[PDB]
Design an enzyme around this catalytic site. Structure first.
Site, short mmCIF file in Angstrom:
data_model
loop_
_atom_site.label_atom_id
_atom_site.label_comp_id
_atom_site.label_asym_id
_atom_site.label_seq_id
_atom_site.Cartn_x
_atom_site.Cartn_y
_atom_site.Cartn_z
CG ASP A 81 -14.13 -20.06 18.89
OD1 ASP A 81 -14.14 -18.79 19.02
OD2 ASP A 81 -14.16 -20.54 17.72
CG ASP A 119 -12.71 -14.55 21.29
OD1 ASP A 119 -12.37 -13.37 21.03
OD2 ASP A 119 -12.55 -15.48 20.44
CG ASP A 266 -8.91 -15.53 11.43
OD1 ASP A 266 -8.16 -15.24 12.40
OD2 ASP A 266 -9.01 -14.76 10.45
O1 LIG Z 1 -13.13 -11.08 17.39
C1 LIG Z 1 -12.57 -12.32 17.05
C2 LIG Z 1 -13.56 -13.37 17.51
O2 LIG Z 1 -14.83 -13.06 16.92
C3 LIG Z 1 -15.87 -13.92 17.34
O3 LIG Z 1 -17.17 -13.59 16.81
C4 LIG Z 1 -17.88 -12.49 17.36
C5 LIG Z 1 -17.61 -11.23 16.51
O4 LIG Z 1 -16.28 -10.79 16.66
C6 LIG Z 1 -18.60 -10.14 16.87
O5 LIG Z 1 -18.45 -9.00 16.07
C7 LIG Z 1 -20.01 -10.70 16.75
O6 LIG Z 1 -20.93 -9.69 17.08
O7 LIG Z 1 -20.13 -11.73 17.71
C8 LIG Z 1 -19.35 -12.86 17.35
C9 LIG Z 1 -19.62 -13.97 18.35
O8 LIG Z 1 -21.03 -14.11 18.51
C10 LIG Z 1 -15.52 -15.35 16.88
O9 LIG Z 1 -16.58 -16.27 17.18
C11 LIG Z 1 -14.18 -15.79 17.47
O10 LIG Z 1 -13.73 -17.04 16.97
C12 LIG Z 1 -13.08 -14.79 17.16
O11 LIG Z 1 -11.88 -15.16 17.86
#
Ligand SMILES: OC[C@H]1O[C@@H](O[C@H]2[C@H](O)[C@@H](O)[C@H](O)O[C@@H]2CO)[C@H](O)[C@@H](O)[C@@H]1O
Length: 293
Positions: A81, A119, A266
């Site tokens: 993460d 992720d 979350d």
């Molecule tokens: O999808 C769950 C996941 O999302 C993560 O963030 C992403 C996001 O989903 C995406 O739309 C965006 O463009 O990018 C970010 C990351 O830069 C989130 O950080 C995770 O904790 C989560 O499990």
């Protein structure tokens, strides 16, 4: 053939949802609904290499005794993460490799569905080039090792339709040996519609020699919250999506699964909300209520 067809997915009798549904006074229809729906069991660095084998053997054996397919999510990657709300993972690649070996030892030849590192590939660019290469090597190690259980249906996590492009993610999947696995997973812990994820999944499938995928429908019944930062972090107004099934609407979609467990937070999400993974009865109730239950 679809390795997920032919038996029900395993309902974890010890989930926080089950505990809440049993403790509810009076009984609560929303908690009961969520509790009785098969999800996935998440393993991370709280389950050390020394013992996780036994944990896995126990869970897959229990699922076999129930005539059901267990779904396990591996969430132990180093620098997990990228140190955000769900920080953790094993300290080094060596530790991670020993963990994967132990998980594989516990699987043996038993049926299981494995979701590999939500992720990890999609978020990899937060790392240095050297660390990113190591991450790909570790995900490839998971694929090469876990697939030695012929009865493990392995799905490498591939983000979602608004994260990397289909082309970019397909390149990463091909690099980590997706061809040796069953395929990939989409929408884990997110909220995009099933239709959107099918179009994205079929595109990736086309670019990975016809690989198959699963979609997390745990919380996507009302689609996503309006486009925003942290719109993925405990958003309100979301609904439970389709219950787990192999009766999907995508040519290469093996199943809709609940990978994320509805009710779990979350993260703190910049609002002092419960730590990532903690079960919140109210959250499970709201998701069920929003789906009309
Ligand atoms: O999808 C769950 C996941 O999302 C993560 O963030 C992403 C996001 O989903 C995406 O739309 C965006 O463009 O990018 C970010 C990351 O830069 C989130 O950080 C995770 O904790 C989560 O499990």
């Amino acid at each position: 053939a679809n390795p997920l067809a032919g038996k029900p997915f395993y309902v974890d009798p010890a989930s926080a949802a089950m505990v809440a549904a049993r403790n509810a006074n009076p009984p609560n229809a929303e908690l009961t609904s969520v509790a009785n729906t098969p999800q996935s069991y998440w393993l991370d660095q709280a389950f050390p290499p020394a013992t996780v084998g036994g944990t896995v053997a126990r869970y897959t054996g229990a699922a076999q005794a129930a005539g059901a397919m267990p779904v396990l999510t591996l969430y132990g990657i180093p620098h997990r993460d990228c140190g955000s709300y769900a920080s953790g993972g094993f300290a080094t690649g060596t530790d991670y490799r020993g963990w994967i070996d132990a998980v594989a030892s516990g699987l043996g030849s038993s049926p299981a569905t494995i979701i590999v590192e939500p992720d990890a590939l999609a978020m990899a660019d937060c790392l240095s080039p050297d660390q990113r290469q190591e991450r790909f090597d570790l995900v490839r190690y998971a694929v090469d090792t876990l697939t030695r259980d012929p009865a493990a249906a392995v799905y490498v996590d591939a983000g979602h339709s608004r994260w990397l492009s289909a082309e970019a993610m397909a390149a990463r999947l091909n690099d980590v040996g997706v061809g040796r696995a069953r395929g990939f997973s989409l929408n884990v812990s997110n909220f995009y519609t099933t239709d959107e994820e099918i179009g994205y999944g079929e595109a990736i499938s086309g670019l990975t020699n016809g690989s198959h995928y699963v979609i997390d429908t745990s919380r996507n019944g009302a689609g996503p919250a309006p486009d925003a930062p942290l719109n993925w972090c405990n958003p309100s107004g979301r609904a439970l999506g389709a219950p787990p099934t192999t009766a999907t609407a995508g040519a290469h979609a093996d199943a809709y699964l609940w990978i994320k467990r509805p009710g779990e937070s979350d993260g703190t999400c910049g609002r002092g909300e419960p730590q990532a993974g903690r079960f919140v009865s109210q959250y499970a109730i709201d998701l069920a209520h929003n789906a009309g239950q």
